[PDB]
Amino acid sequence: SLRLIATEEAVTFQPVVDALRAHSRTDDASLDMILVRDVYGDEPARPAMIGRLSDVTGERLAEMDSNGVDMHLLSLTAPGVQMFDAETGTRLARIANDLMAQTVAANPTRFAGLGTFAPQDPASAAREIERVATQLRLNGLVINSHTNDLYYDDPFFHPVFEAIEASGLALYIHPRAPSKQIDRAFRDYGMNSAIWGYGIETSTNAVRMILSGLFDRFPRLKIVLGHMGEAIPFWLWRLDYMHGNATTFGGAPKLKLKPSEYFRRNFAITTSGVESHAALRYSIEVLGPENVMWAIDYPYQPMAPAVQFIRTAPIPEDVKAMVAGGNAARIFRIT
Amino acid sequence: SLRLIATEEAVTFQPVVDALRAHSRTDDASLDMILVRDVYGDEPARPAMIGRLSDVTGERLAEMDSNGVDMHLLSLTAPGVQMFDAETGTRLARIANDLMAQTVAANPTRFAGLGTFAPQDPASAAREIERVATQLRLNGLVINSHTNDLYYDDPFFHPVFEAIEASGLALYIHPRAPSKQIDRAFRDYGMNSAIWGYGIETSTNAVRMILSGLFDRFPRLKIVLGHMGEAIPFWLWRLDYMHGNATTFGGAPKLKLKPSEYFRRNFAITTSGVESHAALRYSIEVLGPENVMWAIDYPYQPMAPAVQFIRTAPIPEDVKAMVAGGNAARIFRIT
Numbered sequence: 001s002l003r004l005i006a007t008e009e010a011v012t013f014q015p016v017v018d019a020l021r022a023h024s025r026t027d028d029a030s031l032d033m034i035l036v037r038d039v040y041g042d043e044p045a046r047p048a049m050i051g052r053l054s055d056v057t058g059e060r061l062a063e064m065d066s067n068g069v070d071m072h073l074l075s076l077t078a079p080g081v082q083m084f085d086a087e088t089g090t091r092l093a094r095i096a097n098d099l100m101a102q103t104v105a106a107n108p109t110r111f112a113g114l115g116t117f118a119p120q121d122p123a124s125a126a127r128e129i130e131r132v133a134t135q136l137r138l139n140g141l142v143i144n145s146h147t148n149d150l151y152y153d154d155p156f157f158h159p160v161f162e163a164i165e166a167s168g169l170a171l172y173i174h175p176r177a178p179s180k181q182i183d184r185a186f187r188d189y190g191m192n193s194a195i196w197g198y199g200i201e202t203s204t205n206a207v208r209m210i211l212s213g214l215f216d217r218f219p220r221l222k223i224v225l226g227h228m229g230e231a232i233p234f235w236l237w238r239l240d241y242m243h244g245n246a247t248t249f250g251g252a253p254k255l256k257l258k259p260s261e262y263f264r265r266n267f268a269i270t271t272s273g274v275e276s277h278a279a280l281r282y283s284i285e286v287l288g289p290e291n292v293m294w295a296i297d298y299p300y301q302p303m304a305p306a307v308q309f310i311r312t313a314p315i316p317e318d319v320k321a322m323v324a325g326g327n328a329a330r331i332f333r334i335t
Numbered sequence: 336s337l338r339l340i341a342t343e344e345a346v347t348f349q350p351v352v353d354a355l356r357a358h359s360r361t362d363d364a365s366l367d368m369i370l371v372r373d374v375y376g377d378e379p380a381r382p383a384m385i386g387r388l389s390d391v392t393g394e395r396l397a398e399m400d401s402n403g404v405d406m407h408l409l410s411l412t413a414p415g416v417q418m419f420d421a422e423t424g425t426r427l428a429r430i431a432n433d434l435m436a437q438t439v440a441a442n443p444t445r446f447a448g449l450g451t452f453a454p455q456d457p458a459s460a461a462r463e464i465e466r467v468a469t470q471l472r473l474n475g476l477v478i479n480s481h482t483n484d485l486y487y488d489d490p491f492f493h494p495v496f497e498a499i500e501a502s503g504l505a506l507y508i509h510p511r512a513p514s515k516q517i518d519r520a521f522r523d524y525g526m527n528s529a530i531w532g533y534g535i536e537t538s539t540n541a542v543r544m545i546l547s548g549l550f551d552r553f554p555r556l557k558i559v560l561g562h563m564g565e566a567i568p569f570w571l572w573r574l575d576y577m578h579g580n581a582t583t584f585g586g587a588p589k590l591k592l593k594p595s596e597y598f599r600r601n602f603a604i605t606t607s608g609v610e611s612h613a614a615l616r617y618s619i620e621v622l623g624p625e626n627v628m629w630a631i632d633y634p635y636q637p638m639a640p641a642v643q644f645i646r647t648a649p650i651p652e653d654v655k656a657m658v659a660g661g662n663a664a665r666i667f668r669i670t
């Protein structure tokens with residue numbers, strides 16, 4: 001009877017798959033090409049993945065039922081539509097969002113959905129964000145860290161965040177591989193991926209957002225970070241302590257709040273890929289129990305262990321209910 | 336009467352200062368030049384820092400006395416001698432280590448010392464490490480993350496680690512600014528420094544060391560990381576979980592232990608710059624109480640708050656004693 005709403009659950013659609021299959025044959029130097037060739041390539045190292053990402057009502061729903069999971073909140077899998085040229089990305093975002101709405105509508109008690117967009121073209125992405133919010137009535141938004149090797153402090157993306165803030169939709173900033181600004185250090189030992197690169201790429205993006213003052217410009221933004229907040233909850237004291245030096249000697253702009261206060265006000269986190277009771281308890285302690293959500297990270301992680309992690313969490317039942325689904329129901333407006 | 340041994344306490348000596356003053360005028364593109372110009376430059380934004388780093392027996396000792404701090408474990412301040420050419424770095428490491436040994440000998444109940452080296456020349460560095468251990472009999476070693484924009488998984492540095500392992504001295508890997516591999520993303524909002532770049536640079540170095548299998552080659556190495564382990568303690572579950580993918584699809588070498596097992600076996604951490612009781616408790620829980628040490632990070636942080644942080648830590652008195660000084664006395668050979 002614990003209501004479980006999993007918040008970082010990947011899906012894909014045939015038009016996006018086809019575009020990535022084509023993209024896999026190009027000489028794109030993005031570090032995401034490792035993943036793209038592994039999953040979408042002509043000789044894939046991970047040949048079952050397209051099928052598992054594409055499936056919603058077969059194995060996925062069967063696994064949900066066997067583990068007592070009420071819902072998946074679906075998101076177009078990284079790297080979404082962000083690797084394509086602007087026209088292509090804009091077209092495919094629309095298509096993927098329409099298909100997400102269609103998927104959710106077939107089983108709305110079991111699936112909710114996040115829309116995505118192509119920030120390669122900020123003006124067009126702003127229009128699509130508005131369409132996602134008001135015409136499709138999806139539950140929120142998802143984007144995969146950097147676009148065009150730029151981070152979201154860049155004023156280039158202001159029209160995107162203006163539209164997101166106005167829409168009231170939370171934005172899940174999911175990882176992708178380290179951008180070209182930092183990828184040189186992530187070429188070895190599989191560090192391009194979830195084992196290290198994903199967290200460094202995504203957390204650096206979010207820290208730039210905070211320190212740049214994005215949340216003074218757009219104070220009603222809600223951002224969600226998976227992987228126990230990409231470790232930002234662990235760094236809060238030092239982010240705050242060193243901020244004086246940053247604005248005094250480092251040219252950082254003066255902010256209305258402390259870095260950690262933006263993190264608690266404007267961000268929430270999920271437990272995707274971090275099935276640690278100690279890290280969960282730490283995060284609840286420093287963020288508050290309203291700011292932590294459960295996730296599986298299916299199909300990149302299996303459902304049973306993630307479910308058992310939350311069902312056995314050494315926290316009171318009321319807090320467990322918040323983490324398991326209550327918070328997600330609030331943040332992603334799930335009835 | 337808690338015995339307090341602070342383990343990340345920076346010092347400098349005139350010959351190194353003079354060399355950095357000269358270096359500040361060069362066209363070196365290293366991100367450390369920001370700090371170097373701010374402290375050692377002809378028109379320094381932080382003019383009092385050289386005096387504070389240079390002082391051992393004046394203000395530093397008075398502050399130790401007024402706060403009841405037993406000892407500082409001294410280290411040549413970042414970037415140490417690593418920015419110089421090999422000949423210069425090698426020469427200056429010898430001098431700086433002799434001066435460190437003399438500083439310690441002058442007040443051995445109040446100061447312990449870490450020797451440094453210039454890994455620009457691994458053969459010469461290996462010889463200096465041996466001298467530090469056997470002739471100077473210093474308490475350990477210190478190096479500031481990368482050298483020549485390479486990380487310590489590189490076989491280029493094997494003679495260094497062979498020598499460190501044989502010496503039995505622990506190596507404190509202190510931060511410096513992000514290397515050229517990653518520095519593009521750390522040029523804004525003061526992120527070059529302790530607020531973010533230091534942690535990403537140093538943790539990525541350490542993660543490369545672990546995933547490369549360095550600790551299978553040299554299983555007796557002891558490495559110390561400040562700033563609450565540069566957040567690696569927070570990432571342990573995910574580092575372990577994703578390791579199968581890394582070795583299966585990512586070309587990472589198979590290891591004898593799990594990544595988190597190398598971290599507990601071969602690393603210890605300090606609390607420098609992270610005066611959070613929650614983060615301290617988390618670290619003691621996941622690493623064990625023997626693996627956590629207290630530090631101040633003087634003169635970049637003030638002593639009083641660091642001292643009051645540990646004196647008021649909500650942990651049992653025997654564990655507090657271990658963290659405050661007992662572990663340091665073991666790891667750094669202090670009577």
Ligand SMILES: COc1cc(C(=O)O)cc(C(=O)O)c1
Binds near residue numbers: 193194297
């Ligand atoms: C492309 O999307 C992915 C996402 C995750 C994640 O940690 O969120 C992991 C993988 C992966 O394991 O390769 C891939």
Ligand SMILES: COc1cc(C(=O)O)cc(C(=O)O)c1
Binds near residue numbers: 414
């Ligand atoms: C030159 O070495 C430094 C070290 C630290 C540290 O956090 O360990 C901070 C600063 C700084 O605040 O600029 C400088």
Ligand SMILES: [Mn+2]
Binds near residue numbers: 008272297
């Ligand atoms: Mn994911």
Ligand SMILES: [Mn+2]
Binds near residue numbers: 607
């Ligand atoms: Mn320091």
